[PDB]
């Protein structure tokens, strides 16, 4: 009988929740992402910005090799910090710019030991001695705290920002504020489903909430507009036209922007002309009878427009179907049964043409990021339409078989959300470490041309890059392992800035310490991304094998080296890995690593991408859905009911449950479901009275319909995508889908089967 997920999450919330977590100790283990506590910097970076698979690295490569516990970090550079927590500080080192070690170039952080009266500071990453520049000098005091420390953030805090000097800028000149380019697919499909009008009408409202720093009065971000369908229609909206102009470019293939001035204006100054256009586009193409559309040319065009205005940008593309019109990036309908052991299954997840990767590189080269709002209704080849937006650091939103009376609010919520996102532009992240190990692998919505620079055309508060480290030499149980993430970027106001995250981990020659300091949620986030990237390179059965064998290997190692002698009939698991099997099984059961019977490639590709960008908070929930019982709900005096295991076993014919993984939100109803509840929630008197196909928000209700709506809100709270509600009636209804998220049941193998499997190979490693 194993320590279930719920128990593990609850126990931590008990002992660590509602308490202050001061990041003052080195290899200090933080609470689980599932636990709500207050965090005060004080030295090392907040666990909200960066968590690790272990907060105590093995000292040598062979040790690491024995254990096989991947050493990595999940980094969310711009993670939203709670209102009740202290915000980052902006350090300006003047003309010279931020002080950095001359050897490894690490920034001035709390990890620099000031010596010799405070004239020379030895660097903590490579041990090189530096000369404290003139203007920066300061006297040490008792053991060297410099008398500066607590006054200067860069000296006392884990996270903070530096002002970037011109040599941190492209062409050594002050960058320009970014621009937003809206590109609307106006082919038949989106004209009919009333999407075009929706986007135009609703765009008049949202264009106002466009982000701008407090220090300024109006947003420095300009805007541009485009429509298309195998042909592009640019629009001139200069702040001096009573009427907007339209320029059609039909030369797809060798696309170009027919403008400069009139394309990318201040929404405020050109307000009335833009609205004018926005009222018009819907009518304009109303009778369009065009069905085929292009794609690569659109991304191509926006990037071009940005390169011209010489500024970074973000493309908000609204597409509907598989782009078939002849032009570069023409996509066919290549959905084949090349899987399960095809060894060639990988090709299904890669883009068709070789153009998309190139386009992605050109975009990144010019600080152009592409976010795609896709409204498919049939195969669309997501492995292709989502590459540029993944590699470019954009976001991909898919709304399958869109229907206005149901999905309107979901999409509009996503769009508002995505526009108001705190975002940085034309960034490059670099992860420096101390002597002994180094960043050797990266996973995330990123692009990399060399082996050290993680390029992100655009980065936001939700995006998390996962970094794998490897041993370079040997680490000291004395100095431990340091990590300094640094993201250089351009702000929406046009300023070059640096965000720094320092984190001190412990080191050790003792395996006990390695395990004692692991975080299952971290480890799972790594394995997921690691495997999900492998899909594009090795047979899935090859990936699954590595996952299972690495899992059994880790536990075997712990068993033969740390665990106190116990009977062979038992299976030992360190507290750090109590729930690792459960979660690992979930990854293996997931559709990305599974197969054909149901689930579209489009759905597999989509999920494979969404996860690649996730942080620990996100991945935890995605793989182990949260299941809340609603029938047993405490009326008005709630605070979100206790979670229940992801098994069918915890469902009752008399109950009503809420299951959410962060993307989908199911409202399950049993047959013997109390008519009292079904009334105060769906306003209909009985169970058989509800229609699934009507998954829209139900108001009214005084005690319950309100109390349920409350929890649905608090659940969506910290979640980036707005979930798609789906009501399920127990006995033989759509429920088939629902059962998939009951990740503990067999559905692959059940949690129990997998546990039973690991033990076999752990025994095989006869010890």
């Amino acid at each position: 009988a194993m320590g279930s997920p719920i128990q593990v999450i609850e126990n931590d919330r008990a002992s660590r929740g509602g308490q202050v977590y001061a990041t003052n100790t080195r290899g200090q283990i933080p609470p689980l992402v599932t636990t709500d506590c207050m965090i005060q910097d004080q030295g090392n970076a907040s666990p909200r910005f960066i968590r690790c698979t272990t907060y105590c690295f093995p000292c040598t490569s062979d040790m690491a090799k024995q254990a096989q516990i991947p050493l990595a970090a999940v980094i969310k550079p711009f993670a939203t910090i709670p209102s009740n927590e202290s915000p980052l500080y902006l350090v300006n080192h003047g003309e010279s710019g931020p002080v950095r070690c001359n050897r490894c170039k690490a920034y001035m952080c709390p990890f620099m030991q000031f010596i010799e009266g405070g004239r020379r500071y030895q660097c903590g990453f490579c041990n090189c001695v530096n000369d404290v520049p003139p203007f920066y000098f300061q006297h040490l005091d008792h053991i060297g705290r410099r008398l500066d420390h607590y006054e200067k953030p860069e000296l006392s805090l884990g996270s903070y920002e530096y002002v970037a000097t011109l040599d941190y800028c492209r062409k050594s000149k002050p960058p320009n504020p970014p621009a937003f380019i809206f590109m609307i697919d106006v082919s038949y499909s989106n004209i009919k489903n009333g999407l075009v009008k929706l986007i135009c009408e609703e765009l008049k409202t949202m264009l106002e909430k466009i982000p701008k720093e407090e220090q300024e009065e109006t947003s420095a971000i300009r805007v541009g507009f485009i429509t298309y369908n195998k042909v592009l229609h640019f629009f001139n909206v200069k702040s001096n036209l009573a009427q907007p102009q339209m320029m059609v470019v039909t030369d797809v293939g060798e696309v170009f922007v027919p403008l400069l001035d009139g394309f990318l204006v201040n929404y405020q100054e050109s307000q009335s002309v833009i609205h004018n256009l926005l009222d018009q586009i819907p009518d304009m193409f109303a009778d369009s009878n065009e069905n085929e559309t292009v794609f690569a040319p659109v991304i191509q065009a926006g990037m071009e427009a940005l390169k011209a205005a010489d500024c970074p940008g973000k493309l908000f593309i609204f597409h509907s179907s598989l782009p078939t019109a002849e032009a570069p990036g023409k996509l066919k309908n290549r959905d084949d049964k090349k899987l399960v052991n095809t060894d060639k299954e990988k090709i299904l997840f890669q883009p068709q043409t070789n153009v998309y990767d190139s386009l992605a590189k050109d975009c990144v080269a010019h600080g152009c990021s592409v976010t795609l709002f896709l409204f498919p209704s049939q195969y669309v080849d997501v492995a292709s339409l989502g590459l540029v937006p993944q590699l470019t650091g954009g976001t991909l939103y898919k709304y399958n078989n869109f229907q206005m009376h149901l999905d309107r609010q979901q999409f509009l919520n996503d769009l508002r959300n995505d526009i108001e996102k705190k975002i940085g532009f034309d960034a490059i992240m670099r992860v420096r470490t101390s002597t002994g190990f180094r960043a050797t692998d990266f996973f995330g919505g990123i692009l990399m041309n060399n082996t050290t620079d993680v390029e992100m055309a655009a980065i936001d508060c939700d995006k998390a890059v996962t970094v794998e480290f490897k041993h370079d030499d040997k680490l000291s149980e004395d100095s431990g392992a340091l990590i300094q993430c640094a993201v250089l970027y351009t702000t929406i106001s046009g300023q070059r800035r640096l965000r720094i995250h320092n984190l001190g981990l412990n080191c050790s020659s003792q395996l006990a310490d390695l395990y004692k300091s692991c975080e299952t949620d971290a480890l799972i986030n790594f394995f997921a991304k690691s495997a999900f990237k492998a899909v594009l390179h090795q047979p899935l059965k090859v990936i699954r094998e590595i996952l299972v064998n690495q899992t059994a290997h880790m536990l075997a190692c712990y068993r033969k080296n740390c665990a106190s002698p116990s009977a062979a009939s038992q299976l030992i698991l360190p507290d750090s890995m109590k729930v690792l099997p459960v979660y690992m099984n979930c990854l293996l059961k997931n559709c990305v690593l599974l197969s054909r019977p149901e689930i579209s490639t489009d759905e597999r590709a989509y999920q494979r991408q969404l996860v690649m960008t996730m942080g620990v908070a996100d991945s935890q929930l995605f793989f182990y859905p949260q299941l809340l019982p609603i029938h047993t709900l405490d009326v008005k005096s709630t605070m979100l009911p206790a979670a229940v295991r992801c098994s069918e076993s915890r469902l009752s014919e008399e109950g009503i449950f809420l299951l959410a993984n962060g993307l989908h939100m199911f409202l399950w109803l049993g047959v013997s479901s109390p008519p009292e509840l079904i009334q105060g929630i769906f306003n209909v008197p009985s169970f058989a009275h509800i229609n699934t196909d009507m998954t829209l928000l139900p108001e009214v209700g005084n005690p319950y319909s309100q109390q349920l709506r409350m929890i649905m809100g608090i659940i969506q709270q910290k979640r980036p995508y707005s979930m798609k509600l789906t009501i399920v009636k127990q006995r033989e209804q759509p429920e088939m889908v629902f059962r998939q998220f009951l990740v503990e049941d067999k559905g692959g193998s059940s949690y129990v089967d997998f546990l039973c499997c690991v033990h076999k190979e752990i025994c095989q490693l006869l010890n």
Binding site: A1, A567, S569, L573, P574, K578
Partner: peptide, 6 residues
Amino acid sequence: TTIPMD
């Protein structure tokens, strides 16, 4: 955490 495999 110990689990006896029955």
